[PDB]
Design a protein around this ligand. Structure first.
Ligand code: COA
Ligand code: OAA
Ligand code: OAA
Lengths: 434, 434
C-alpha cells in the first residue's frame, strides 16, 4: 500500500530539522521592533512565534503550505460521496506539506474510525455534568480527562529521549482526533450517553460523516449536511499560530504537557467570547435581532440594532480580526457554499446574516474603534448549522472545538520534533514602561 | 470596620487607568528588537506583556510592588497563631499595591471561609475520577468545572458593558480562591470526598489553616505545618507574567473566558514537567541520592552523585532558572524557615538538601553547560512538606496550583479593569524566516 501518515511524516522530518539548523545560524538577525503598543495591546503585530502549517496574510487571508483555500478545495481528496474537501486530508497536508492521495486518505479515515472509542470513566465523567453546564466547559474537561490515555505523559515519566518526543505526541494526536467527535456528540446528546458513547462508526466512511452519525444526522438523506460539515471542519482546522486556541495549545504544550492537556487549554481559550465562542454569540445575536425587528424589516432596523449593541458597550459578534483587514475568505467560502443552495438562501435567518454583512461594516467604521470592520468566519458558520437543524447556539463552538484540534495538534507534533523550548516571554509593569 | 478588599481596589483603579493612558500616549515608542532567536526560542527575553503585581529583579530576585520577600515577611499580617505571612495578605498586596492591616485581612479570611463550599456536581465529578488519574489533571478539571458558578460568564451571556468587566471578574476570583484549597484537598483525599467536600470551616481561621484542616492536618499539634503552608503559598503566588501558568491564565482570560476557565488553563500549564513538576522531581532525586549515599555521607559522596547525574545527560533538579542569575530569595526564605526548627534541621533528608545546595553550584559551574548554577525555590519546598508528613511528591504540584491562583487572578482583575485587548501575536514559518 501507499505510505501511511506516520511514515509520510518521517520522510519529511529530516528536511525540517536541517532548515531549523539553517534558520538557527541567523538567530542574531533582527527582523522587527518591539514598541509600547505591542506590550499593552496583547502582542498585536508582534511576529513572535513559529507555526509551520499555515501563515496568515492580512490582505490575502490564510494559506496552508502556500496553498489557498480554493487550492485546497481543488487538490485535497473528497469522500466517497459529495464534493467538499475532507478535513483529514487537510490534516495530512498540514503535517507533511504534501497533498495525500485518495487511497492514503481512505486508509487514514479507517484508522480514525477504529480509534474513536472511549474509556468508561470518560462516559461517567460526562454523565456527572449538570444539564446547565456550558457545552464548551464540558468539551474542555473531557478532552483533558483523556490524558489518562496519554502515551506521551506515560513515556515522558518513564524517561524519554528528546529526538523521539514526537512519536508519542503523534500517537496521542491521532488518538484525540479520532475520539473528539464522539466526545463532542456526547456533549450534544446528554440523555443518550450510554448509546452514543459505545455505538460503532461506519468503517467505510470519513471523519465528518462519522461525526454527523454520532450527531444523529447520518445516512444518505443527510448527505448535503455531510458536505457542509467536511467543508466547515477543513476551513476551521488551522489559522496560523497567534490565535488564542492554537497559541494556548502550544503554550501549554511547550511545558511538556501532553496533547490532551494542551488542546484542552486551547478549548478553554476557544470558549472565550472574543475567540471561538463568537460562533455561538453571532447566532444568539442574530436570533435576538430577528425577534426585535420582526419578519419584514428595513435596512435601518438592522443599523439600529447594531448601533444599539455598540452603545451598550458590547461588541458586534462575527466582525473584526486580530490580523485580517479584509473580509475573511473562510467567510466567503461558507457564503459560496450557501450560494448554490436555494433552500439555504430562502432561510430567513441566513438572509438576516447576509443583510447584516452589507450593513455592519459601515456601522463599525462609523464607530471607529476597530481596525477591521469586515466579517470573519463566525459570522456565517452558525446559521448554516441552524439551517440543517442544529438550533441551539450554546453548542456551536463545540463543532469548532472538533475542527480546531487539527492545526494545533500538527504544530505540537512539529514542536516536539524540532525540540522547540518552553514559551516564556518577558513581562513588564506600567511603571517600568514609564 | 476598615475598607474591604473590593473597596480598597476601587480607590486604586482610577490611578492605574490614568497611568495606562499616559503609557498609551507613547505607544509608538521603540523599546526593543525582535530577532530570529525570539521566534524560535519561545519568546525568551522578549518584553511583550503587561504584569503589574510583580517584577523579577534578575540579580535581587522577585519583588512584589517593589517589596522584597523579607519585606513582605515582616510587614504582611500573620494569623491568629504563628509567625509566617498570610497568603491572603499577599493577595491583598498584589491587588492593591498596599500592605493590609491585620483587621482588613481577618475580614477577608472570613469571606474566604464563607465562600469555600462547592456545588454537589463538583463532588460527583471528582468522585468519577479514576484512581490512576494524575492529580494535576484532576485539579485542572475541577477548576474548569467550577465555571458553572461564574458570575462573569453568566453576566457576559446576558449582555454586559466592557467598562463593568472587572467586578464580576473580581467576584469570580475571590470565589475561586475560596474554593481551590477544598478542591485541592479532595484531590489529595479521594476516599474522603463526602466529608472534605462539605465540612464547614472556622471563619475566624486563616486560609492556610483551613486548607491544612481539610488536609487532615488541623489543630495545635500541627501549628508548624500551618506556618510552612502559609509561607509556601505566599511565596509561590506570583512570579511575573512570563511563566507558563500565569501566561496561560492571561492568554485565555484575554479572549474573555472567565477566571475558572482561564486559571484551569494555567493549571494545565502548571501540569507540564518543565513548569510545575520540579518540586516533585527534586524530592525523588534527593531520595535516590539518599538511598545510595545513606544518612551519614561525605561531601564527595554528594559530588559523585551530582557528576553522575550530569554525565547521564540529565539536569540536577531545582537548580537554574530562565531569568534569575542568583540564588532565589524564595529558596532562602524556606531555608530560613528550617533554621528556627531543630527537628527539621535534624531530618537527614533536609540535611541532604542543605548539603546539596553547598555542593551543586560548584559542580554545575565546572560542568559548564548551565548559565544559572544556583538553587531555585523548588529545591527546598518538597523536603519541607515531606518532613511534616506529606510524603507523596506526586501531589506537590497540586499545592503549587493553590498558590499560583493568587498572582494570575490579580492580573486578570487588572486586565479587565484596564480593558486590555485579546492576546494575539503573529506567527511565521521557518521558510519565511529564511
Ligand atoms: C476579533 C477581535 C477580538 C480582534 O481584536 P483586536 O485585534 O484587539 O481588535 P482591534 O485592534 O480592532 O480593537 C480596537 C478597538 O475596537 C474594538 N472592536 C474591534 N472589533 C470589534 C467588533 N467587531 N465590534 C465592536 N468593537 C470592536 C475593540 O474592542 C477595541 O475597543 P476597546 O479598545 O474600546 O476595547 C475583535 O474584532 C472583537 O472582539 N470583535 C469580534 C468578535 C468576534 O467575532 N470574535 C471572533 C473573531 S474571529
Ligand atoms: O482562529 C480563528 O478562527 C480566528 C483567528 O485567526 C484569530 O483569533 O486571530
Ligand atoms: O532554564 C532552562 O532550562 C534553559 C536556560 O535558561 C539555561 O540554559 O540555563
Amino acid at each position: 500500500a501507499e505510505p501511511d501518515l506516520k511514515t509520510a511524516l518521517k520522510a519529511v522530518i529530516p528536511a525540517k530539522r536541517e532548515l531549523f539548523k539553517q534558520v538557527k545560524e541567523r538567530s542574531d538577525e533582527v527582523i522587527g521592533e518591539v514598541k509600547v503598543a505591542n506590550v499593552i495591546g496583547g502582542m498585536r503585530g508582534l511576529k513572535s512565534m513559529l507555526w509551520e502549517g499555515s501563515v496568515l496574510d492580512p490582505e490575502e487571508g490564510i494559506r496552508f503550505h502556500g496553498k489557498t483555500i480554493k487550492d485546497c478545495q481543488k487538490e485535497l481528496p473528497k469522500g466517497t460521496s459529495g464534493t467538499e474537501m475532507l478535513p483529514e486530508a487537510m490534516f495530512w497536508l498540514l503535517l507533511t506539506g504534501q497533498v495525500p492521495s485518495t487511497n492514503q486518505v481512505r486508509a487514514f479515515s479507517r484508522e480514525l474510525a477504529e480509534q474513536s472509542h472511549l474509556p468508561q470513566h470518560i462516559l461517567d465523567l460526562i454523565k456527572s455534568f449538570p444539564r446547565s453546564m456550558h457545552p464548551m466547559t464540558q468539551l474542555s474537561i473531557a478532552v483533558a480527562a483523556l490524558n489518562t490515555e496519554s502515551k506521551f505523559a506515560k513515556a515522558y515519566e518513564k524517561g524519554l529521549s528528546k529526538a523521539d518526543y514526537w512519536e508519542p505526541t503523534f500517537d496521542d494526536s491521532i488518538s484525540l482526533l479520532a475520539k473528539i467527535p464522539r466526545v463532542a456528540a456526547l456533549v450534544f446528546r446528554p440523555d443518550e450517553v450510554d448509546q452514543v458513547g459505545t455505538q460503532a462508526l461506519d468503517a467505510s466512511q470519513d471523519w465528518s460523516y462519522n461525526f454527523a452519525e454520532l450527531l444523529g444526522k447520518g445516512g444518505k438523506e443527510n448527505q448535503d449536511f455531510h458536505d457542509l460539515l467536511r467543508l466547515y471542519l477543513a476551513l476551521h482546522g488551522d489559522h496560523e499560530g497567534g490565535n488564542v486556541s492554537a497559541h494556548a495549545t502550544h503554550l501549554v504544550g511547550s511545558a511538556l504537557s501532553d496533547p490532551f492537556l494542551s488542546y484542552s487549554a486551547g478549548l478553554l481559550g476557544l470558549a472565550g467570547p472574543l475567540h471561538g465562542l463568537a460562533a455561538q454569540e453571532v447566532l444568539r445575536w442574530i436570533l435576538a435581532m430577528q425577534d426585535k425587528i420582526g419578519t419584514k424589516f428595513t435596512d435601518d432596523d438592522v443599523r439600529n440594532y447594531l448601533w444599539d449593541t455598540l452603545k451598550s458597550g458590547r461588541v458586534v459578534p462575527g466582525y473584526g480580526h486580530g490580523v485580517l483587514r479584509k473580509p475573511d475568505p473562510r467567510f466567503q467560502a461558507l457564503m459560496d457554499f450557501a450560494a448554490t443552495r436555494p433552500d439555504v438562501l430562502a432561510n430567513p435567518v441566513f438572509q438576516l446574516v447576509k443583510k447584516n454583512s452589507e450593513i455592519a461594516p459601515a456601522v463599525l467604521t462609523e464607530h471607529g474603534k476597530t481596525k477591521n470592520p469586515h466579517p470573519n468566519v463566525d459570522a456565517a458558520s452558525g446559521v448554516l448549522f441552524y439551517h440543517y437543524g442544529f438550533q441551539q447556539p450554546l453548542y456551536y463552538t463545540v463543532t469548532f472545538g472538533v475542527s480546531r484540534a487539527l492545526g494545533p495538534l500538527v504544530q505540537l507534533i512539529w514542536d516536539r520534533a524540532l525540540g522547540l523550548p518552553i514559551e516564556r516571554p518577558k513581562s513588564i509593569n506600567l511603571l517600568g514602561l514609564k
